[PDB]
Amino acid sequence: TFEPATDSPLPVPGVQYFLQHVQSGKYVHPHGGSDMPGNDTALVLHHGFDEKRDALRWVFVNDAENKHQLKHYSSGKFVHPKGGKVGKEATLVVHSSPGRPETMIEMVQEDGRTYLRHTDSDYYVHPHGGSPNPGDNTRLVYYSGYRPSLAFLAIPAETLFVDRIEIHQAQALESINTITSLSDEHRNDTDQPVQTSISVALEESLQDSAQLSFERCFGLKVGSEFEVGLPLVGKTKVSVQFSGSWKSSTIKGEVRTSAVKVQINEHVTIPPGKCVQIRIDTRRCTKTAPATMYLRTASGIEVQRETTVTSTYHYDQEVHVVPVT
Numbered sequence: 001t002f003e004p005a006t007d008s009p010l011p012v013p014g015v016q017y018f019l020q021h022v023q024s025g026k027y028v029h030p031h032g033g034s035d036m037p038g039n040d041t042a043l044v045l046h047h048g049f050d051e052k053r054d055a056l057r058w059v060f061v062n063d064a065e066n067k068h069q070l071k072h073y074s075s076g077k078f079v080h081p082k083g084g085k086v087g088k089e090a091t092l093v094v095h096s097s098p099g100r101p102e103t104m105i106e107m108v109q110e111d112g113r114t115y116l117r118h119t120d121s122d123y124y125v126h127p128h129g130g131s132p133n134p135g136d137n138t139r140l141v142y143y144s145g146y147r148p149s150l151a152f153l154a155i156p157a158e159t160l161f162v163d164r165i166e167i168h169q170a171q172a173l174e175s176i177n178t179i180t181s182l183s184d185e186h187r188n189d190t191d192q193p194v195q196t197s198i199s200v201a202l203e204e205s206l207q208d209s210a211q212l213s214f215e216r217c218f219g220l221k222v223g224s225e226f227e228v229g230l231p232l233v234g235k236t237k238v239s240v241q242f243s244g245s246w247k248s249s250t251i252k253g254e255v256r257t258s259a260v261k262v263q264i265n266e267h268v269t270i271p272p273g274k275c276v277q278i279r280i281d282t283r284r285c286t287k288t289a290p291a292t293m294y295l296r297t298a299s300g301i302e303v304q305r306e307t308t309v310t311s312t313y314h315y316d317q318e319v320h321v322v323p324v325t
């Protein structure tokens, strides 16, 4: 299963998220839930959720213009300490004023969980009163230190398009192997040559597969199925069709074009008194590489996600009639 505390993805800057306090399940809203909250309106936790509500959406900003800020998607307001100083019980509020070093806020990983933290400080984001299950409309504050109960989950709140995945060629590992299948023995106990049907079923032996793996979870929404060209043996690209969920730590990939045969059917003239076998020799490329996924928002920002590509691919099949003596 997806374990929200141990699998929570780190948010990608410029992408829309919902913020969820893991322990309560409550979401981060401006107080009053407006899409146009006022200056010095508090961030609070509330059970309320509606995928379609833009006032629920937040965007992590980290660019030349703004370093380590959090933005309210519907209003464009940044998240500030109330009064302009991060300190004990300083309420998080939205405000139209641009961000500063003294307002920095980012999601960070500490001992396997994701937390909101004022950058370059020991201040993290707590629910006022520090309850593992705060009540609706509890305000979020800055406070020294962190503990599991404060963990947040950034849930992707828009669907991206996967443009391409680029293998890191220098750390790409390749293990080539020969899968050898022998049919049953067939013997010709007549006094004339018999042309005999010999079949072998190799569906489970020669199953092709591709996997994208992530330390926590993919953490992006990209649709039901997506297709990319992956180099499944040497540098030769093959079309792989992936389906998963943002919560997946492993996305399974299907190979469209099979390069070998999984049903072997040979017509073999067996001479009088002779025994034969079909020998199938199939090559398997077992591959692993770090890779960068390149994805696009509808708003047109290109974003990246590191992954590990793993694949089993079968090529260069040979069939031979071997004598059984």
Ligand SMILES: CC(=O)N[C@@H]1[C@@H](O)[C@@H](O)[C@@H](CO)O[C@H]1O
Pocket: 089, 126, 127, 128, 129, 130, 131, 141, 143
């Ligand atoms: C020991 C303890 O839980 N203290 C918490 C403190 O850590 C912080 O979460 C604060 C925020 O208001 O609430 C307090 O109750």
